[PDB]
């Protein structure tokens, strides 16, 4: 629990959110409410999502007796389990532990929000904006960039929090692509997971792993049962996989150097041959 | 004019060529025709390229009146200035002084051939096939390997030639990659040359040289002129180069131990930031 305490950084974060007076703002991790009290003056409603019941009670107390108190709803509990309401904008200062699952939750949330202004550890922020093959380019980079426009807005020193964290922080903007690309995110993430796990291995090597071959063969057999496709007696899932890698040109490539165009082509090429990822 | 005169090595070279009866064989440097007369019996056509008109005249005489004479075409002159016809396989024994230009001629030749079996000086051969970082791993190794598969096939003692060369020799196989990487060679070689000057020192030391910083700043300014990108007054090429090396993880890497995909990645990292080596 690192409380953002520098008023200038808080004001800049709120400015970057470009609030409208009619906005519902989702605030995740309100801490002691340093940002909440300012958000409440600028928006129609603030929905603060907070894990710790003590910090919930104290937030209610902080706004008690003020003209804006009635514009605050506090949702108690783990945000990752919460069914999130409609919101226009999100500001968030969450622990590093939940940064990844929260980004994915945001990317799939409906109805679409307009933007999110988020505080993350520096490395996590750099990963979100990394290009092919930066050292920090990973599943997080490509999944975020597929579904959203993501920008690194500002560096924030550890000195700005109480108590200070051990690493520097960053403010990032995430604006979800609306409509999103016409791509099944579950399939996409299956392919991305498999190829990035060892992002430095060629795809040929990545797909040779027993765990990979076993699931892909199982799902392919299910596929064929649905679509009435004969599987020869001498079927080899290794050969089937390798011929797709060859035909798409990605066999000798490594996920760390592959962009969105590349993975879309690869996914298309697996799908055309009956391989569908979970 | 070192003429190969060991029939067993001649037989072994022809064997490694894996001739098909329908093949057109380019033989560069046929000498006295020791290999030519054997090639003619196994291939559809032999196109022999020879610089010395005296040897050309003797080669015609050697096949004269034999049943395979009509399958021989002799192209007279410098093979480097010769527009080469289609050929399936190539066999070559040329002076050491033109090994490098001839290799890159073959690699740029279209349509693609299937394989070349070539005689080189020992050290030249060891450089072609060197792996990151064998002692002899160099610009020649990586430039050749970018475009071809290369194998050292056999050592050839100087006594096998008349007259003998001053050095030991090797037989190498070259098979062009088809398709090749879609990399502009002048661009690629710009990066390769720079980094291989001191192949045992790091990339950040290679990129700190005055002349290199001047080149890259000049090229970035050209890219920015093309795209109408404004360059701030306080622009630092040193800083921009360092950020790219840090982003990609290459600051402390050395050309002697970098493979092809390493160079592709580094080149992409510069090019995507507007910095070109051509
Ligand atoms: C004080 S911030 C720490 C983040 C840090 N400043 C950083 O660099 O990003 C953590 C806040 O989020 C709350 N929080 C932690 N986990 C949560 C969760 N799963 N759901 C909702 N709120 C949570 C904490 O109780 C606290 O209010
Ligand atoms: C190159 S010489 C010497 C080869 C020697 N065994 C070696 O490894 O260096 C063998 C043949 O190549 C011919 N030759 C030399 N330069 C040539 C060129 N530029 N184009 C075509 N043939 C050439 C010579 O006349 C001779 O017939």
From Swiss-Prot, chains A, B:
It catalyses: adenosine(1779)/adenosine(1780) in 18S rRNA + 4 S-adenosyl-L-methionine = N(6)-dimethyladenosine(1779)/N(6)-dimethyladenosine(1780) in 18S rRNA + 4 S-adenosyl-L-homocysteine + 4 H(+). GO terms for cellular component: cytosol; nucleolus; nucleoplasm; small-subunit processome. InterPro entries: KsgA/Erm, rRNA_Ade_Mease_Trfase_CS, rRNA_Ade_methylase_Trfase_N, rRNA_adenine_dimethylase, SAM-dependent_MTases_sf. SMART domains: rADc. It is found in: Nucleus, Nucleoplasm; Nucleus, Nucleolus. It comes from the Eukaryota. The keyword Nucleus applies. Keywords: Methyltransferase, Nucleus, RNA-binding, rRNA processing, S-adenosyl-L-methionine, Transferase. It is an enzyme of class 2 (transferase). The keyword Calcium does not apply. Coiled coil: none annotated. Its EC number is 2.1.1.183. Pfam families: RrnaAD. One of its GO terms (molecular function) is rRNA (adenine-N6,N6-)-dimethyltransferase activity. CDD domains: AdoMet_MTases. GO terms for biological process: positive regulation of rRNA processing; ribosomal small subunit biogenesis; rRNA methylation. PROSITE patterns: RRNA_A_DIMETH, SAM_RNA_A_N6_MT. S-adenosyl-L-methionine binds at residues 2, 4, 29, 50, 78, 93. Belongs to the class I-like SAM-binding methyltransferase superfamily. rRNA adenine N(6)-methyltransferase family. Specifically dimethylates two adjacent adenosines in the loop of a conserved hairpin near the 3'-end of 18S rRNA in the 40S particle. Involved in the pre-rRNA processing steps leading to small-subunit rRNA production independently of its RNA-modifying catalytic activity. Part of the small subunit (SSU) processome, first precursor of the small eukaryotic ribosomal subunit. Part of the small subunit (SSU) processome, composed of more than 70 proteins and the RNA chaperone small nucleolar RNA (snoRNA) U3. This is Dimethyladenosine transferase.
């Amino acid at each position: 629990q690192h409380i953002l305490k520098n008023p200038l950084i808080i004001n800049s974060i709120i400015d970057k959110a470009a609030l409208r007076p009619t906005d519902v703002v989702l605030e995740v991790g309100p801490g002691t409410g340093n940002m909440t009290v300012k958000l409440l003056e600028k928006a129609k409603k603030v929905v603060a999502c907070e894990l710790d019941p003590r910090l919930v009670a104290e937030l209610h107390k902080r706004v008690q007796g003020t003209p804006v108190a009635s514009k605050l709803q506090v949702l108690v509990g783990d945000v990752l389990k919460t069914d999130l309401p409609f919101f226009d904008t999100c500001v968030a200062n969450l622990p590093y532990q939940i940064s990844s699952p929260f980004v994915f939750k945001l990317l799939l949330h409906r109805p679409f929000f307009r933007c999110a202004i988020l505080m993350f550890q520096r490395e996590f922020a750099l990963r979100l904006v990394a290009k092919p093959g930066d050292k920090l380019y990973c599943r997080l980079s490509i999944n975020t960039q597929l579904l959203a426009r993501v920008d690194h807005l500002m560096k924030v020193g550890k000195n700005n929090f109480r108590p200070p964290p051990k690493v520097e922080s960053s403010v990032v903007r995430i604006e979800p692509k609306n409509p999103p690309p016409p791509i099944n995110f579950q399939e996409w993430d299956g392919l991305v997971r498999i190829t990035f796990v060892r992002k430095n291995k060629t795809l040929s090597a990545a797909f040779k792993s027993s765990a990979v071959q076993q699931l892909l063969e199982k799902n392919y057999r299910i596929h064929c049962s649905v679509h009435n496709i004969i599987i020869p007696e001498d079927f080899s899932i290794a050969d089937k996989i390798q011929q797709i890698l060859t035909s798409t040109g990605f066999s000798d490539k490594r996920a760390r150097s592959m962009d969105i165009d590349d993975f879309i082509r690869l996914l298309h090429g697996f799908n055309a041959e009956g391989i569908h990822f979970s």
